[PDB]
């Protein structure tokens, strides 16, 4: 079984990082919608944090698997 | 096959085979003298009837001879 | 070729000619029916024998009558 | 068992005769094709008109009764 | 009257359903028509082509292939300007349809009736009567 | 907000007036019958909605309400299976002793001596043995009571009432407009996220909270009435944490992403449960939870009302390369304006999924005690092969209907359809060649082996003892799947299926699953499969590609999808329609699926199923005769059909005598079909003329003039009786054989 | 960029110019092959095709034939190949007789004289190629085995 | 004994079917109604529907009952 850990500030760091990474990515790549103050709506934010949680969870589970944590 | 499947299906198969033979290199050097057509409606009824009948005769002749020979009684 | 005949019970409805996919039939003047016209077959060499003309015939017994005969490349519907 | 099979053979001889007799008597014509004689003994059909005329020739009743002959001799 | 061989053809990306060696060795059929538009039609031999505005020329292997396009062009695009020709490998061009300038469904003077039988179909002779004699079954 | 709900209110009046006027839906049939053909033409075109109406809106409304009617019928059917399990079954007796009691949920009335069909299935019970696998489903659900089966029957009854109400409501009270139905992005988002995703999520939740505790208690050995009721696991988290100690921490490990705490009940074990011979339900719970996450994530792909998402039109129009012209341009317009194009795709996929279901369910038995219930394993494999094959041929049927009717060349210039129709001779000629090559090189190997074995030349055969056609690629893939646990699936503990290699899993001394070795006989029968699938594809594809026109008939689209012929000319154009290729390909589907189920039945009896003796020897049902006898046709005739038809023929006077009766009845129906298949309409119309004369003579002629069936209907009736007769023969033979011996 | 075009710049001909049908590699191979090679006599065309076909016919008859396990397997395989050559050369002869009307010109296969020259070359080449295969397999032990001589 | 009986019964069924086939060929090709006015042959054709419908009846009669008794027994 892959080794996962209880929540720590490092897990929080990975989630926060992945979320911000996806906010910036969503500002660049979402085709239908002041770098972040132009056309930034709730759907765009909600979609990017949805992916940020998907990417963050995948990253946390993988970095816990390999030992990086 | 001759009694259930009928001509239009087979003529459309044969026209794709005619296309393929004419378009295949090293094979289009050889040409038919008679245009390949599907069997006729009456001809295929006869061919299926002959195959049905021959299968009927050969199956029963094999059974009536082998069952009696093998059993002897 | 096939042999296509038109009998004098033809009412000149022009439907068999319209049905013809191969321009076998045409209309000629005839005083026998009320329409003043009867079907004719001057091109039975192009007749494929589809018998669509027979289906379109509204007479009790088809005035247009296809009799399948000798086969040719044209009457066999061969594009090869 | 002999009684039942003899009646089965009676059905088979009568049914093969029905198909063959229907072919012979309707060989020269029928309501579906009155001028059947003009087309011969073995022709495919008269086309899809008048509802459909597959196996309308007298040869085709030979064809259909050949199965019933095989079934009865079976 | 004669087929102008230089008529441009419809834009077809080609197909495998077109004509084979019998077209260049036995007979080929051609159909021409005038279109008011640059419009897509369906080929009898396959997919879709675009007929050009102005005059179009087609090469088909069958007269029914030509008349199938003729009906598609008359019922969907209302072209009544179609002429169907049979082109021999010799280079002879035979005009076919409409044969005398008027459609077969319309009466025309100078048409002689071929195949017309003076009696009804039930007055045909029985085959036994016409057996072993050259006399025809249509009376 | 361009995705919106729009409905016409009170479109159609709920009146019995059109019920009283049969044929109301079409202009041809509404003027009443004059011949008996009208009667047949009534049923033949009833569900052909796009033949009655021009508007896509009324067509879509009729389809939506007919889907609710179908769902109502399925829910009524399910409610009946639950009620027959509750009331007329030995389910409670089967729960106590799953390996000895035979499932039975059907009891016959004593009328004409037919009460012999209430055989001794076990558990102090008499009834018809049932093979649908419902008992194994219910044990997997954790039902453990007939009261809960009554509550499931009522839940099915309530759903059946709600679906028949919803069909009435959505046709007669609030029918959606066409712009509602043409929301493929919204529908896909909801059917991936909502239907499949919350379906898996809710089912995984049920498995974790109900199936897992109840089935752990059942496999521990606790009697069904000693097991706590399924809500007592929901409340008493302490009692649930006894069985799975991870429940002591609750949902904190889920949200904090500490998911390895849940490894007690979300496993990746693989293999089978040794006690039941079924899949580990902890694996099934993890499986459904993982599918739920991806299905919900997938249902966020498409753009609906907020700018995020894909336009499927943009995805399709961007995929074009140098070989394929304009590419997938125009396919979105097709699939949102043609129902038949959607039904062609979805029927081919539903049939493919049903075929996948049959292979995966036998190989990886998913229910407790289903693997060693061999009548159920054979029944559900054979059933889902037939549902798969039928649905695949209906995918080609509605591909033909799309091509004849909904295809417009103007909107399909130089796209993928245009290019396929423009090289259909190359496609059909290459498919024709591969089918000839593969009939020669699969069935001709059988003819070679028949000939050599008949000639005394056993050294000249294709066999394991002679020339060995080994399936090296299939054996190699089996090697990889046996080596996969710990190597390429490192966290797996066992193989995905024991069919690939590994242990023999035995439950109640009967083999649950065991390695299926592949030899020369398996090479030969798999190439038989590849051949029969290829030929069925050739007939169905030749019908789709040549549905609109040929070199033979250049105007085939004007004759329609379903026409009998275009006359005896051009040599004869009998069966030239796309319908007649569906008709001819349903025979070859029958041929294909019959060989697949024969291969499965013989191979599983010969090499998988049987009893485990002391020292782990497995005495198989037919004693390993597949390897040396499935290489000849005489072996299939002798060692499979003749040897195993013993049970149907000798079933009279027992509980399996119904199978002997259906065996004979289906031989009758199959033969009776050949009257419609080998004959033509003109014979029967002239015979009917003589019968009409006999009626006229007695002044008893009907006013609805009797006609022989149409040419197409004679073909359809022949095919329907042929399929019923063949499949019913195989159904009776399979079921009496495996109920007696397995 | 489109890699498929109408064949011979004629849209209504029943062919499509495709990479497989009309690449330079395909055109080079067909022209290089003896049947379509320019400058090649019909007899020489038959000799090259025959040498090829007779050479590879021996191997299936030898390796998979009824007498394969016998020491006379190669002789049986050669004789079976030779018998097949004689049947095929009869087929070539009868096709030539019916298909082509007698004409003076012999420079093409599609002529009565040219197909007779082709059949003559094919027989000589096929018997020679079959013989060459027999000589090579007899001399080389590795060819006598199926490649398992190293094993 | 089995081969001889089976052989000659199959020859019998072929000859009997062929007899009716050539009666159909006779009607199509060699039968002249004017030369055969009100004969046994013309009057057989005159009631062709009585003959065929009564063969249909007896075939159906026997088939329904013989099969029904057999199915009853099964
Ligand atoms: C949907 C699946 C399904 C299936 C296949 C069956 C099948 C069966 N059930 Mg089960 N059943 C079901 C659902 C199902 N049931 C449901 C949902 C319930 C709960 C209400 C029950 C409750 C139930 C009980 C309580 C019993 C059965 C019994 C039976 C058996 C005989 C029934 C019988 O002869 O009725 C025949 C009854 C008639 C009235 C004859 C029908 C004749 C009419 C004309 C039908 C025509 C329909 C009509 C024409 C349609 C048009 C409507 C009209 C407006 C035109 C049979 C095995 C019996 C059994 O197993 O005994 C051991 C039994 O006692 N069933
Ligand atoms: C997330 C929402 C959602 C869900 C669950 C469904 C579900 C379904 N739709 Mg879809 N649909 C949706 C949104 C949704 N749709 C939207 C937004 C549109 C507009 C674009 C459509 C347009 C549409 C069409 C046009 C069609 C469907 C069809 C279907 C049915 C497919 C057959 C099947 O597998 O049913 C069996 C599976 C089931 C689960 C049956 C349950 C039935 C209910 C309705 C499911 C949901 C119940 C409820 C939400 C659950 C509450 C849980 C509670 C106990 C806690 C299925 C009931 C087809 C059909 O059969 O029509 C009836 C059809 O033709 N739908
Ligand atoms: C940088 C962080 C990071 C790290 C170290 C990993 C590392 C890993 N991931 Mg993760 N993953 C990441 C980010 C990361 N991923 C992101 C951003 C996503 C998107 C949400 C995913 C989604 C993802 C899924 C969905 C899965 C993994 C799995 C895995 C493991 C199996 C890889 C393998 O060899 O399978 C080889 C697989 C083959 C088919 C070989 C061919 C591997 C340790 C898998 C696993 O085992 O999880 C435990 C698994 O199921 N990853
Ligand atoms: C749609 C499906 C579904 C539904 C309706 C529920 C519903 C519930 N779950 Mg379950 N659960 C599900 C899916 C589902 N779950 C899945 C997919 C998993 C695997 C990740 C779990 C794993 C799980 C655990 C491990 C536990 C629950 C618990 C609960 C209860 C919540 C009480 C609570 O907050 O204590 C949470 C306790 C905290 C300390 C926080 C509730 C009845 C809890 C319970 O009462 O178990 C019976 C509990 O301990 N669930
Ligand atoms: C989701 C599945 C689905 C759907 C919605 C449709 C819907 C449709 N199909 Mg498609 N089709 C399907 C599956 C489907 N079919 C499959 C699986 C096949 C392969 C067999 C076909 C093959 C097919 C063809 C070949 C044709 C259609 C046609 C039609 C249309 C009208 C049919 C009609 O009125 O029949 C009304 C219903 C009947 C007449 C029922 C009779 C069918 C059998 C004989 C009854 C079965 C009885 C029972 C199962 C077994 C007998 C038991 C016995 C012991 C009592 C309609 C658009 C036809 C059409 O009009 O095209 C537009 C058409 O030509 N389809
Ligand atoms: C057992 C009966 C039988 C047999 C042998 C065949 C044979 C064939 N069918 Mg038919 N078919 C049958 C029943 C049968 N069918 C029935 C009942 C139906 C009902 C609907 C159909 C409907 C049907 C359709 C609709 C299609 C076929 C197709 C095919 C061909 C498949 C290609 C192939 O395998 O070539 C290999 C040939 C064989 C397997 C025949 C057996 C030959 C064996 C191997 C030995 C050869 C003997 C050898 C020549 C001896 C020579 C010496 C001798 C001449 C003296 C092939 C010609 C397809 C086709 O033609 O396209 C490819 C096709 O599309 N069939
Ligand atoms: C009650 C009505 C009725 C009557 C009086 C007849 C009368 C006759 N039929 Mg029958 N016939 C009928 C209905 C009827 N037919 C129907 C509905 C069919 C279609 C299945 C047929 C099919 C049929 C065939 C195929 C044959 C006859 C033959 C005959 C003749 C011989 C008598 C015989 O053996 O019957 C035999 C009867 C049957 C084989 C079928 C019986 C059909 C059912 C039982 C009757 C229908 C009941 C009807 C619905 C009553 C509704 C009225 C109600 C509303 C008040 C005789 C002229 C035979 C003939 O020509 O021989 C001289 C023959 O070969 N008929
Ligand atoms: C088992 C196979 C089989 C069977 C039963 C039949 C049956 C029949 N054939 Mg056919 N035939 C077959 C194979 C078969 N044929 C084949 C392979 C061929 C070769 C093409 C032919 C060619 C052929 C021709 C050319 C002729 C016949 C004729 C007949 C009839 C002869 C017996 C008779 O007159 O009354 C016997 C009647 C029966 C056996 C019918 C059974 C009664 C049914 C089953 C009642 C059951 C009702 C039940 C409730 C239905 C449930 C349906 C469910 C959906 C609700 C009968 C309809 C002749 C005919 O029509 O003469 C009048 C005729 O002209 N047949
Ligand atoms: C279709 C067709 C069209 C027109 C031309 C056509 C070719 C002519 C025609 C074909 C017609 C065909 C094919 C006709 C076929 C006709 C057949 C097969 C007629 C069979 C006749 C057998 C009889 C009368 C047996 C009589 C036995 C008796 C009396 C025994 C008596 C007894 C004795 C002596 C000893 C035992 C005691 C008893 C029982 C008392
Ligand atoms: C027997 C037969 C007929 C005659 C069959 C008819 C007229 C069907 C009439 C049967 C009775 C009248 C009704 C059938 C009822 C059955 C007892 C069960 C039917 C079940 C569904 C119809 C509901 C044809 O018309 C035909 C046409 C083309 C090819 C082959 C054939 C063919 O074989
Ligand atoms: S259809 Fe019959 S009637 Fe009308 S014109 Fe042609 S022939 Fe004369
Ligand atoms: S048969 Fe077809 S082609 Fe010949 S005439 Fe009648 S319609 Fe025209
Ligand atoms: S289907 Fe019946 S009618 Fe149409 S052609 Fe073939 S035989 Fe003649």
Swiss-Prot record, chain B:
Membrane spanning stretches: 46-66
Domain of life, source organism: Eukaryota
UniProt-annotated binding residues for chlorophyll a B3: 1, 9
Binding of phylloquinone, residues: 10
Location in or out of the cell: Plastid, Chloroplast thylakoid membrane
Protein family membership: Belongs to the PsaA/PsaB family.
Role played: PsaA and PsaB bind P700, the primary electron donor of photosystem I (PSI), as well as the electron acceptors A0, A1 and FX. PSI is a plastocyanin/cytochrome c6-ferredoxin oxidoreductase, converting photonic excitation into a charge separation, which transfers an electron from the donor P700 chlorophyll pair to the spectroscopically characterized acceptors A0, A1, FX, FA and FB in turn. Oxidized P700 is reduced on the lumenal side of the thylakoid membrane by plastocyanin or cytochrome c6.
Assembly and oligomerization: The PsaA/B heterodimer binds the P700 chlorophyll special pair and subsequent electron acceptors. PSI consists of a core antenna complex that captures photons, and an electron transfer chain that converts photonic excitation into a charge separation. The eukaryotic PSI reaction center is composed of at least 11 subunits.
Name the UniProt record assigns to this protein: Photosystem I P700 chlorophyll a apoprotein A2
Organism: Rhodomonas salina
Phylogenetic lineage: Eukaryota, Cryptophyceae, Pyrenomonadales, Pyrenomonadaceae, Rhodomonas
Curated annotation (Swiss-Prot), chain C:
Alphabetized SUPFAM superfamilies for the sequence: 4Fe-4S ferredoxins
Gene3D superfamilies on file: 3.30.70.20
A GO cellular component annotation in the UniProt record: chloroplast thylakoid membrane
Binding-site positions, [4Fe-4S] cluster 2: 20, 47, 50, 53
A Pfam family of this chain: Fer4_7
Key words, A-Z: 4Fe-4S, Chloroplast, Electron transport, Iron, Iron-sulfur, Membrane, Metal-binding, Oxidoreductase, Photosynthesis, Photosystem I, Plastid, Repeat, Thylakoid, Transport
Subunit and partners: The eukaryotic PSI reaction center is composed of at least 11 subunits.
Protein name according to UniProt: Photosystem I iron-sulfur center
């Amino acid at each position: 079984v892959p080794q996962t850990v209880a929540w720590s500030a490092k897990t929080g760091a990975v989630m926060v990082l992945s979320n911000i990474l996806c906010i910036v990515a969503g500002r660049y790549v979402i085709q239908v919608k002041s770098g972040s103050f132009a056309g930034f709506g709730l759907p765009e934010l909600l979609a990017s944090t949805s992916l940020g949680h998907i990417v963050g969870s995948g990253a946390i589970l993988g970095l816990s698997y390999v030992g990086v944590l | 096959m001759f009694l259930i499947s009928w001509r239009g299906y087979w003529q459309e198969l044969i026209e794709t085979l005619v296309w393929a033979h004419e378009r295949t290199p090293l094979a289009n050097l050889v040409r038919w003298k008679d245009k390949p057509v599907a069997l006729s409606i009456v001809q295929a009824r006869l061919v299926g009837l002959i195959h049905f009948t021959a299968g009927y005769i050969f199956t029963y002749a094999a059974f009536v001879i082998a069952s009696t020979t093998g059993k002897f009684g | 070729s096939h042999s296509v005949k038109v009998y004098d019970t033809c009412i000149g409805c022009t439907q068999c000619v319209r049905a013809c996919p191969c321009d076998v039939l045409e209309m000629v003047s005839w005083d026998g029916c009320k329409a003043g016209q009867i079907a004719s077959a001057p091109r039975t060499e192009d007749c494929i024998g589809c018998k669509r003309c027979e289906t379109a015939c509204p007479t009790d017994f088809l005035s247009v009558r296809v009799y399948l005969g000798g086969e040719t490349t044209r009457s066999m519907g061969l594009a090869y | 068992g002999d009684f039942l099979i003899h009646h089965a053979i009676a059905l088979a001889l009568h049914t093969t005769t029905l198909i063959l007799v229907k072919g012979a008597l309707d060989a020269r014509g029928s309501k579906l094709m009155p001028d059947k004689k003009d087309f011969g003994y073995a022709f495919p059909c008269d086309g899809p008109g008048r509802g459909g005329t597959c196996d309308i020739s007298a040869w085709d009743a030979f064809y259909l009764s050949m199965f019933w002959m095989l079934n009865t001799i079976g | 009257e004669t087929l102008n061989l230089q008529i441009p053809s419809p834009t077809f990306e080609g197909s495998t359903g077109g004509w084979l060696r019998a077209a260049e060795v036995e007979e080929k059929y051609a159909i021409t028509w005038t279109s008011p538009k640059e419009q897509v039609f369906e080929m009898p031999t396959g997919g879709a082509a675009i007929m050009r505005q102005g005059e179009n020329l087609l090469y088909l292997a069958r007269k029914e292939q030509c008349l199938a396009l003729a009906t598609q062009v008359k019922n969907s695009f209302k072209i009544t300007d179609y002429k169907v020709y049979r082109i021999f490998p010799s280079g002879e061009v035979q005009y076919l349809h409409p044969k005398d300038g008027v459609f077969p469904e319309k009466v025309n003077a100078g048409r002689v009736g071929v195949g017309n039988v003076s009696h009804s179909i039930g007055k045909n002779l029985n085959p036994a009567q016409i057996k072993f004699t050259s006399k025809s079954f249509n009376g | 907000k361009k995705v919106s709900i729009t409905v016409d209110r009170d479109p159609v009046a709920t009146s019995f007036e059109k019920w009283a006027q049969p044929g109301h839906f079409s202009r041809t049939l509404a003027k009443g019958p004059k011949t008996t053909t009208w009667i047949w033409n009534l049923h033949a075109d009833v569900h052909d909605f796009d033949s009655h109406t021009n508007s896509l809106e009324d067509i879509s409304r009729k389809i939506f309400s007919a889907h609710f009617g179908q769902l109502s019928i399925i829910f009524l059917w399910l409610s009946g299976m639950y009620f027959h399990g509750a009331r007329f079954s030995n389910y409670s007796a089967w729960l106590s002793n799953p390996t000895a009691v035979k499932p039975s949920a059907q009891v016959v009335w004593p009328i004409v001596g037919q009460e012999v069909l209430n055989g001794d299935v076990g558990g102090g019970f008499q009834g018809v043995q049932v093979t649908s696998g419902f008992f194994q489903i219910w044990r997997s659900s954790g039902i453990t009571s007939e009261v809960e089966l009554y509550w499931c029957a009522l839940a099915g009854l309530i759903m059946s009432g709600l679906m028949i109400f919803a069909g009435w409501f959505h046709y007669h009270k609030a029918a959606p407009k066409l712009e509602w139905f043409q929301n493929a992005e919204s529908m896909l988002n909801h059917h991936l996220s909502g239907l499949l995703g919350l379906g898996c999520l809710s089912w995984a939740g049920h498995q974790i909270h109900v199936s897992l505790p109840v089935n752990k208690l059942l496999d521990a050995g606790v009697a069904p009435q000693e097991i706590p009721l399924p809500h007592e696991f929901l409340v008493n988290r302490d009692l649930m944490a006894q069985l799975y100690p991870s429940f002591s921490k609750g949902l904190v490990p889920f949200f904090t992403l500490n998911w390895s705490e849940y490894s007690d009940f979300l496993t990746f074990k693989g293999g089978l449960n040794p006690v039941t011979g079924g899949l580990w339900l902890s694996d099934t719970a993890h499986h459904h939870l993982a599918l739920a996450v991806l299905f919900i994530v997938a249902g966020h792909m498409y753009r609906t009302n907020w700018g995020i998402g894909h336009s499927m039109k943009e995805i399709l129009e961007a995929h074009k390369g140098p070989f394929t012209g304009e590419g997938h341009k125009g396919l979105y317009e097709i699939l949102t304006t043609s129902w038949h194009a959607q039904l062609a795709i979805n029927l081919a996929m539903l049939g493919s999924v049903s075929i996948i279901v049959a292979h995966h369910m036998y190989a990886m038995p998913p229910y407790p005690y289903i693997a060693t219930d061999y009548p159920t394993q054979l029944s559900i494999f054979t059933h889902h092969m037939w549902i798969g094959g039928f649905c695949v041929c209906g995918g080609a049927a509605h591909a033909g209907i799309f091509m004849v009717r909904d295809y417009n060349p103007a909107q399909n210039y130089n796209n993928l359809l245009d290019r396929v129709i423009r090289h259909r001779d190359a496609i059909i000629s290459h498919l024709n060649w591969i089918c000839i090559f593969l009939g020669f090189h699969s069935f001709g190997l059988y003819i070679h082996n028949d000939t050599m074995r008949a000639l005394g030349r056993t050294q000249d055969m294709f066999s394991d003892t002679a020339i060995q056609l080994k399936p090296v690629f299939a054996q190699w893939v089996q090697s990889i799947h046996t080596l996969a646990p710990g190597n390429t699936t490192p966290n797996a503990l066992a193989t995905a299926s024991y069919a690939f290699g590994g242990d023999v899993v035995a439950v109640g001394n009967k083999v649950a699953m065991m390695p299926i070795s592949l030899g020369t006989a398996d090479f030969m029968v798999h190439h038989i499969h590849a051949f029969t699938i290829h030929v069925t594809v050739l007939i169905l594809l030749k019908g789709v590609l040549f549905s609109r026109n040929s070199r033979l008939i250049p105007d085939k689209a004007n004759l329609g999808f379903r026409f009998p012929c275009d006359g005896p000319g051009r040599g004869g154009t009998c069966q030239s329609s796309a319908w007649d290729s569906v008709f001819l390909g349903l025979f070859w589907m029958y041929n294909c699926i019959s060989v697949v189920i024969f291969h499965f039945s013989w191979k599983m009896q010969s090499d998988v199923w049987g009893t485990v003796q002391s020292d782990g020897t497995v005495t198989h049902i037919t004693g390993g005769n597949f390897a040396q006898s499935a290489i000849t046709i005489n072996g299939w005739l002798r060692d499979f059909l003749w040897a195993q038809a013993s049970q149907v023929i000798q079933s009279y006077g027992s509980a399996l005598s119904a199978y002997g009766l259906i065996f004979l009845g289906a031989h009758f129906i199959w033969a009776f079909s050949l009257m419609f298949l080998f004959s033509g309409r003109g014979y029967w119309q002239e015979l009917i003329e003589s019968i009409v004369w006999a009626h006229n003579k007695l002044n008893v002629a009907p006013a609805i003039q009797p006609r022989a069936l149409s040419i197409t209907q004679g073909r359809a009736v022949g095919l329907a009786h042929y399929l019923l007769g063949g499949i019913g023969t195989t159904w009776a033979f399979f079921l009496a054989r495996i109920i007696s011996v397995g | 960029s489109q890699f498929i075009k109408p064949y011979n710049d004629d849209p209504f001909v029943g062919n499509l110019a495709t990479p497989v049908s009309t690449s330079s590699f395909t055109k080079s191979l067909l022209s290089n092959l003896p049947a379509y090679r320019a400058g090649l006599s019909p007899l020489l065309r038959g000799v090259e095709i025959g040498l090829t076909h007779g050479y590879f016919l021996v191997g299936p008859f030898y390796k998979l034939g009824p007498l394969r396990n016998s020491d006379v397997a190669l002789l049986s395989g050669f004789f079976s190949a030779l018998g097949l050559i004689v049947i095929l050369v009869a087929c070539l002869t009868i096709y030539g007789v019916v298909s082509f009307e007698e004409t003076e010109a012999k420079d093409q296969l599609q002529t009565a004289k040219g197909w007779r020259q082709f059949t003559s070359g094919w027989l000589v080449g096929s018997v020679g190629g079959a013989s060459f295969a027999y000589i090579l397999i007899s001399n080389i032990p590795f060819l006598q085995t199926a490649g398992m001589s190293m094993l | 004994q089995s081969a001889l009986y089976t052989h000659h019964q199959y020859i019998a069924g072929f000859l009997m079917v062929g007899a009716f086939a050539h009666g159909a060929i006779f009607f199509v090709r060699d039968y002249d109604p004017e030369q055969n006015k009100n004969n046994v042959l013309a009057r057989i054709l005159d009631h062709k529907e009585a003959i065929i419908s009564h063969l249909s009846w007896v075939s159906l009669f026997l088939g329904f009952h013989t099969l029904g008794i057999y199915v009853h027994n099964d």
